[PDB]
Swiss-Prot record, chain B:
Taxonomic lineage from the root: Eukaryota, Metazoa, Chordata, Craniata, Vertebrata
UniProt name for this protein: Activin receptor type-1
Origin species: Homo sapiens (Human)
Annotated localization: Membrane
Keyword GTP-binding: no
Effect recorded for G158D: In FOP; variant phenotype
Cytoplasmic side: 3-300
Gene designation: ACVR1
Amino acid sequence: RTVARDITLLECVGKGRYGEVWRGSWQGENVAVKIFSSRDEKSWFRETELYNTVMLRHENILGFIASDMTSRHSSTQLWLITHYHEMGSLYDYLQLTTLDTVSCLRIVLSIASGLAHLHIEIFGTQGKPAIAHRDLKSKNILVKKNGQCCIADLGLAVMHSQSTNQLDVGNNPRVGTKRYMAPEVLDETIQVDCFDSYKRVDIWAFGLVLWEVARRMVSNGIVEDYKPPFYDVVPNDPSFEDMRKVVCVDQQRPNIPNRWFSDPTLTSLAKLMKECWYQNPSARLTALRIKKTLTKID
Amino acid sequence: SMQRTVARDITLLECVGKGRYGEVWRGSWQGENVAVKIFSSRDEKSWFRETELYNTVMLRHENILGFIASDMTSRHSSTQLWLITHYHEMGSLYDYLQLTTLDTVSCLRIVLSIASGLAHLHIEIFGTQGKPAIAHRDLKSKNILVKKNGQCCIADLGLAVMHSQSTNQLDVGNNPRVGTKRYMAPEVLDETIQVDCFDSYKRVDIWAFGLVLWEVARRMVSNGIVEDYKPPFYDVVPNDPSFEDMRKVVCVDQQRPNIPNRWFSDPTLTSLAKLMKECWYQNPSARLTALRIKKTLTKI
Ligand SMILES: c1ccc2c(-c3cnn4cc(-c5ccc(N6CCNCC6)cc5)cnc34)ccnc2c1
Ligand SMILES: c1ccc2c(-c3cnn4cc(-c5ccc(N6CCNCC6)cc5)cnc34)ccnc2c1
């Protein structure tokens, strides 16, 4: 029996504009400590609430352990303590690793299973509201030693319940990662009062991640280098406007390499991406349909 | 004496109060008294709301309870949440008025200090070093502390809402709670309140303030005459009145707190009576603002 604040921070393993993640030691075991900037305090709270009230728990959702906050003198320390994944993010994993058909499908099915689990309302004692993520990307997915993935970073999440028909968007000024923003977010037509709109934004982002992964699967003895979505048409840290011109005005999407089309698996994955990338959000596949499709190609 | 792992440097000494969130304790921290407000896990939204208001608005004022710290720790099926503030040994206005009568100077000092706290919450300050308007939403004599200098400060921002013009997303939070029934304005009771107008919430605070002003005025001695402490509407609702009990008296019956005709033979009580009256208009838009009350009281 010990307290969360007594976790020993050992090394910083990730660092962005909104926070840091550290490998920490708690009673001799590795944990991950995400430390939020005070500026992203509403994300820390949303995640904490989700994990500690909805009790979100699933093989493909990052395992919560604890949350801790202390504030004084305008200094606020915001910690979310989770299961530690030493292989790091999917983004990290894809840089050099190449995949065979089995490992590629294991990765994308586990992500689909995580997302389907989030999107669906479950009834009964072990139930949950429907949840949309709103910042899905390869840096927000962890790779486990067993080859499965799990989805992290629920701080922008929005929720919906069938019995009340109530949408819970919380209040957070943080917006999703610009590279992964759906057309409707970029041209500001997204119907913000509709829960389904948020699920559809997640589906868009999932198709981009699918593309990042599929590039690294070997066929005919070759792969493509890791690249981020839209690598050839926008800069690093692209602006809202850079993305809008590419995605909305030019109607661009990632290109599919020729070699994919002689591989049955990559051909099926290209079709799935297309079904995630429709300009019309209501035309996109659901997470459930994506999971069903992937279950059938392995 | 007890410590909790949610803040190991604070020693809890005694429970001094209970509220809609739980207990408040006198505690000791680095040799000084502090007040520790302990939330149940049920109310982590109010805990966060109050913390954010103190921590990001950097809300500070002589007549707003002073924030010291906030802590929370959470695991599966165990969550502790604390707000630590300055401790006022004279206790709440509600308790003080049970035991204490007021002279004219003390009465004015109390009601002016409440008005000044409330105007500081309510006032939106525009520009780069501004401040959102804040509405309290549970103003009552139990949520005001008496300080040793004879001024008061307003406490409990767990239900408070804020609005800055610059940001376009009006949000009454998502915590399932409204005000103390006894202090609820008529428009809350008959559901006519204009929920999309941030100022509606300010006007609801002004109605509550007039009730507190009545509670206080009752205990000012005038020509050797004073009334016992009573809560607002004590003579027409029971203890712990329901939303419905209140709806009947304030809306259907149109009841207001009685203003003894005798008050009008005293200049201070006369001014206060006029102020209460102008906090109690059925029409929320006709009510005085916190700032105007403050100026009127500063003139006395
Ligand atoms: C978003 C993403 C993650 C989290 C996490 C999180 C949980 N586990 N974990 C592990 C790493 C990590 C480990 C090892 C490496 N490397 C080893 C390979 N070579 C160099 C890089 C890199 C990264 C990062 N973050 C996390 C916890 C809480 N919120 C999050 C929100
Ligand atoms: C609402 C009200 C208060 C707070 C407080 C808070 C700060 N100071 N303080 C002091 C008391 C208190 C001291 C002495 C007495 N008595 C001794 C004299 N005889 C009558 C009983 C009674 C009460 C209670 N709460 C507080 C902190 C945080 N949120 C709040 C929200």
